[PDB]
Amino acid sequence: VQTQDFKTAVQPDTNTAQLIKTYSNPKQRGDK
């Protein structure tokens, strides 16, 4: 899972979110 370019109030790059993204959306690019 790729990290986002920068953090946002609505979308923080939390470890829990990245763990959920493994099965929810593993193909997200992360390029804003």
Automatic annotation (TrEMBL):
Domain of life: Viruses
Region (Disordered) location: 1-32
Compositional bias ranges of the Polar residues kind: 1-27
Signal peptide boundaries: none
Protein's name according to its UniProt entry: Vp2
Organism lineage string: Viruses, Riboviria, Orthornavirae, Duplornaviricota, Resentoviricetes
Stretch of the intact protein here: 20 to 51 of 955
